[PDB]
Design an enzyme around this catalytic site. Sequence first.
Site, mmCIF file in Angstrom:
data_model
loop_
_atom_site.group_PDB
_atom_site.id
_atom_site.type_symbol
_atom_site.label_atom_id
_atom_site.label_comp_id
_atom_site.label_asym_id
_atom_site.label_seq_id
_atom_site.Cartn_x
_atom_site.Cartn_y
_atom_site.Cartn_z
ATOM 1 N N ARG A 7 23.628 28.772 -9.043
ATOM 2 C CA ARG A 7 23.102 30.120 -9.062
ATOM 3 C C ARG A 7 21.947 30.042 -10.058
ATOM 4 N NH1 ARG A 7 23.832 34.958 -12.860
ATOM 5 N NH2 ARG A 7 22.879 36.654 -11.638
ATOM 6 N N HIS B 255 26.590 29.176 -6.216
ATOM 7 C CA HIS B 255 27.384 29.646 -7.360
ATOM 8 C C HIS B 255 28.539 28.673 -7.616
ATOM 9 C CE1 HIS B 255 24.936 32.918 -6.177
ATOM 10 N NE2 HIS B 255 25.451 33.766 -7.050
ATOM 11 N N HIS C 270 50.655 25.090 20.572
ATOM 12 C CA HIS C 270 52.018 24.604 20.802
ATOM 13 C C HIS C 270 52.309 24.438 22.292
ATOM 14 C CE1 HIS C 270 52.351 28.996 21.038
ATOM 15 N NE2 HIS C 270 53.405 28.805 21.812
ATOM 16 N N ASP D 191 51.228 35.849 20.247
ATOM 17 C CA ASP D 191 51.391 36.911 19.250
ATOM 18 C C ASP D 191 50.899 36.416 17.892
ATOM 19 O OD1 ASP D 191 52.667 38.653 21.106
ATOM 20 O OD2 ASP D 191 54.619 37.727 20.690
ATOM 21 N N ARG E 74 20.165 26.587 -5.063
ATOM 22 C CA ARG E 74 20.320 27.499 -3.934
ATOM 23 C C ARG E 74 18.920 27.922 -3.437
ATOM 24 N NH1 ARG E 74 21.331 33.730 -5.930
ATOM 25 N NH2 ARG E 74 20.390 33.528 -8.016
ATOM 26 N N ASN F 60 54.991 38.108 25.385
ATOM 27 C CA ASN F 60 56.369 37.815 25.760
ATOM 28 C C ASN F 60 57.400 38.351 24.767
ATOM 29 O OD1 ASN F 60 56.644 35.904 23.618
ATOM 30 N ND2 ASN F 60 55.727 34.307 24.908
ATOM 31 N N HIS G 130 35.293 34.345 -9.749
ATOM 32 C CA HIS G 130 34.168 33.821 -8.985
ATOM 33 C C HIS G 130 33.759 32.410 -9.368
ATOM 34 C CE1 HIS G 130 33.863 37.910 -7.660
ATOM 35 N NE2 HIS G 130 32.777 37.662 -6.950
ATOM 36 N N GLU H 117 34.547 35.215 5.646
ATOM 37 C CA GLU H 117 34.331 33.776 5.484
ATOM 38 C C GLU H 117 35.092 32.941 6.504
ATOM 39 O OE1 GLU H 117 35.636 35.722 3.128
ATOM 40 O OE2 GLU H 117 33.851 36.167 1.949
ATOM 41 N N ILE I 104 58.386 37.472 21.997
ATOM 42 C CA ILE I 104 59.207 36.497 21.274
ATOM 43 C C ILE I 104 58.436 35.688 20.226
ATOM 44 C CG2 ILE I 104 60.439 34.300 21.533
ATOM 45 C CD1 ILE I 104 62.167 36.721 22.204
ATOM 46 N N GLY J 4 46.397 24.713 17.285
ATOM 47 C CA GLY J 4 47.714 24.504 16.710
ATOM 48 C C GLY J 4 47.769 25.525 15.601
ATOM 49 N N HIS K 19 61.355 28.398 22.827
ATOM 50 C CA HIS K 19 60.065 28.170 22.181
ATOM 51 C C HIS K 19 59.646 26.756 21.789
ATOM 52 C CE1 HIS K 19 56.489 28.992 19.814
ATOM 53 N NE2 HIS K 19 57.018 28.266 18.845
#
Lengths: 647, 647
Positions: free
Chosen positions: A511, A452, A66, A155, A348, A185, A464, A402, A187, A114, A259
């Site tokens: 899988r 999988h 920002h 923050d 896989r 800050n 899953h 992940e 804020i 961003g 802000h």
Amino acid sequence: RDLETLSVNAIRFLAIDAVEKARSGHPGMPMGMAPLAYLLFREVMRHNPLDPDWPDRDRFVLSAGHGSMLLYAVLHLTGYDLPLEELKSFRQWGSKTPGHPERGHTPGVEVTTGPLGQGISTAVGLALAERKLAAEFNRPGHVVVDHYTYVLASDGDLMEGVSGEAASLAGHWGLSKLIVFWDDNRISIDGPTDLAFTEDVLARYRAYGWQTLRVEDVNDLEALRKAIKLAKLDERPTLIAVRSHIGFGSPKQDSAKAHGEPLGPEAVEATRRNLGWPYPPFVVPEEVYRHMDMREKGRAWQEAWEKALEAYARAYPDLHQELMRRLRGELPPLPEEPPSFDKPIATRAASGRALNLLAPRLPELLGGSADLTPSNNTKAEGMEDFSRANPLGRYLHFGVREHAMGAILNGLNLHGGYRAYGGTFLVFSDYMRPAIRLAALMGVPTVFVFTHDSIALGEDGPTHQPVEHLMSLRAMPNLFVIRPADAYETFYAWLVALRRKEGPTALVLTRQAVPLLSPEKARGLLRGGYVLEDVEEPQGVLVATGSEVHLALRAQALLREKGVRVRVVSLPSFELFAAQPEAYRKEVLPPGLPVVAVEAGASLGWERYAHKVVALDRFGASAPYPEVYERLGFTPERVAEAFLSLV
Amino acid sequence: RDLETLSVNAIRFLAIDAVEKARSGHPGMPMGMAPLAYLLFREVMRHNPLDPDWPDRDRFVLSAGHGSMLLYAVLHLTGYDLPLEELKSFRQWGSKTPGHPERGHTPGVEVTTGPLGQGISTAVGLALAERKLAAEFNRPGHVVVDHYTYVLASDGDLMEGVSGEAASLAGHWGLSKLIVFWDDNRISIDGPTDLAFTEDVLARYRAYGWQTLRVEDVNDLEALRKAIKLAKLDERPTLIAVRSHIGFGSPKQDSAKAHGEPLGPEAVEATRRNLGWPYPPFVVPEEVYRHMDMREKGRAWQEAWEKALEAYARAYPDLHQELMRRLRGELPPLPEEPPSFDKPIATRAASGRALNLLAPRLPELLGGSADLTPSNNTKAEGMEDFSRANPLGRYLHFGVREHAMGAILNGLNLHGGYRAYGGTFLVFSDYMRPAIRLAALMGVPTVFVFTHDSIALGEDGPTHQPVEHLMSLRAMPNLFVIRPADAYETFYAWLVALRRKEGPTALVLTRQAVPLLSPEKARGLLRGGYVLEDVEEPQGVLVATGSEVHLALRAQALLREKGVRVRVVSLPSFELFAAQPEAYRKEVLPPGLPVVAVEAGASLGWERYAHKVVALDRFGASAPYPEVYERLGFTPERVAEAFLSLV
């Protein structure tokens, strides 16, 4: 002290005025952090405004996107190709100064930021990349890789889980050249930060194994310099909490109102008076432009790096040639012949086989997994674990992270010198969607390995088993989604992914073990979609992807036994197929001919190619394969019936 | 000690034998944590196996879902309706013992787990709800709400960024009755946990404001009792690190091999000897069953509560009536007319207006936002912020923690007594995907409020502008995706969302102001899709969603100029429309005539309803609305042009 103050204010008002003219943007944080921006671009970092791609440049990441204007102001002031005219076009259509930084769109923008947490996390990949590249190429009297990674975070960045995940890994890996500045800050957008953020931030970072420092006043330049020096001496990554006043110098100081909205005419004039700035909008005294100009220091630094490469090239011919090829992102020739398969195998495992073949020929290739190494088949034969005690390892254990893995992968791929991939179960691509989108946005060729891929995974159950995943990824711009049908398509799937430099590629694997196709046929994957098994005067088409291609082939047989002739089309990739000329697409799927699609996933979107689909529009079930697969409707009989209903 | 040891082993072997018979599953952790499950269900917790739904029961959440047999075994031993035969049916089609815990499928299962981090994060919501319900309904001499939230988490749960976000909030909120047990066995799927996890976990949680305790041996029941007592006496939520050996008592003890695969015959036999267990597979001695039977104590605890309630009903008729109503999940009477609007307005503002009208009638309604309160319009007039000092506050500032917000909203909605919604930008739904999915899997009616739904949000740019989001969410089973066209459709979208109890609902709102539609027509929203503006003898149909309905109306008029008659259809929800009788659907979209779709998002999927689509299949741009909207191709001329190419 006068030039410093004059230059810092230059950054401040270029930020204020750009936002005012655009009547949109965030002026508050740039106003408060201006001093740090000045320090990094003028004194601390080695960089070349004439060549933002200089490989040995220090890298700055504005995780708090920002505050874009803070970056645009310092880039403009130091000599980058960002004219005042662009600053006057902040947030305007087609300008090189978009609301949030866009890597590859603005010179000097290292990462597209961003979405909070992405910048600071991606930076761990950049730092990891420098550290590993240094270990691989530096030699006695030959330091060809030596630069730091700096980040400015808010923050919000620190509250995001991904930043915590990346922080944990950065400390674990001992990334001593990663230096993060936190704008403390107090804020937030909702008001005072203590409304939802009161943890002991620095104590948490120390737990991760980082060094923490504090600078009580961002304006105290000497305090900042000393902190940065201490950090460089420390073998741990460092988080520097820097106290500042959002909207410093204005009536809206220390308020969320400073802000994300223009200060307004009143506030602007008052700020000008408070800070003693007599210059009109966008006007900066030549004296500042002269003091901030970094074109000559940049040339000097890069030139010195280049001479160092000359020496390196003399003492280490082979290493020099490889470093250069990799820094230029040039792939060496790729094998054309797939590995030999002689029996049913999961894609896989076929992927692991393709990797055993590819990795030895690609020293830039780095792999890893989110604590699913044995389940993802991502650790190639030859690769050893990277660690503090083994900086040369090309395999990365990301742990159950992940999201940070995605961000770190993007960071490794952004640095230059490496090509990295990471694996997890397809269902867990949900934990890292932000990083996947960011790669698509930046045009970074990160390769995401997802195993999988369906209910066929069995007993682990609905939590899953992917359903909506294939289609949710296919809807995303600039993402190739390849679901190879067998061991052979899997090999060509990897070639496609490696050769694709425009954006990320998602490889979707099984899988369970599946039959082999002929290596000659599977080469068709290179076209995205192709005719697998044709027939004389087809009366229709069964189109399938991945494992369901084998279901389709069986349905084709059942149909053939009844006198009905349908061809089978394998469509490993929607995007690649759509990129083919219209004539080819029509040869594969002839208009007028009924088509039935088969895919163990959501049916939404298949109407684009089929008149009827054998899909899954409900969550799975915990049961063994193939029972779970069959009972949920995936049988050759059902596909056959689906088609018979069309004729 | 005889009965304790015998009972604990009963848990270990039911798990080992169930996994062995299924030839699938995870026996390692259940073996190590058996002592804790024994202690919790037999001694510590108040619960009733006869009535798993007793509202004042303590809540147990198995975050480390893979260890499901640990839970199924103890549920079986203590008297819950989970017969031996189900244990013998572990991971088999249709059994009450799926690979991972599923809420609603097994009595006693509080949360559906498996994806690491969800269980422990969802628990924060369960504890918040208990704490808020206590503050709201408890009176002097009348303690009608009083239970603890216990969680069993693994290394993986603690590495996931979402668990970090939730813990930060738990400490911030001072959820003193939240007690988490971490299985510190030093083993991950990839091998020794130190391969990627070396942070000082307890130091981090202390930084979050939690109390941290250590139990050096899980087999030491007294130490466990002590820790739990210490945690209950502390006003901070507590994390208890419990050391154990994965696969304790077996040849695979302290090895990754004990994690997710059957022990194997030899290993099983060796375990029975090492631990002195002579009982055959699935056989548990009567003495243990008699010892573990909690049915009698369970009925006694709940009865005492029923008494406190009747006493409460006598002392506070009104309070009691509302509590019972809320606990039963019954909605009170609600406004039937939407608020009154007079000028163009963003649907997010219209949403805020709907909430001001709805919230006063719904004391069970909790709202919140991930640091975007002013931008999401989620704080209804009348709502006060919740805080440790103001526990009655109905508004939650989640901070920049979308994922944890998701999990916490689910917990709040799962607990009983509340109905919670939270907001953020549509693009950031990506940060909370797993929580959204968990809600759909569990059928928990969480309402997710997503604003800034398209490129029309303007200047913030491509990193904030959604593209693939609508379709990626529509592909997910059990999720209503409602994109109201205007202020009036928005009020009815809220009614639909509130009345839908079968699963979650995502409300997609705009940043920019859009025209108002007829109040009476907007009611068509209740049918998912409806004819907004019809014409006689229609030559075609323009179907749209959200803001694009207004563009479609403009294209309809433009067409009229050229003498082309087209009907405009509003489709605020694909799911609600699909749920309508075929006849109604065919009435809204008469077969045969051409349809052009219009929606500022990916085209993939629109083929299900339109022959041509005016959509966006590329990322956005940083520019002002309506410019960015028009230059990206969303204009009446484009739409008109698109349809004219079909007629």
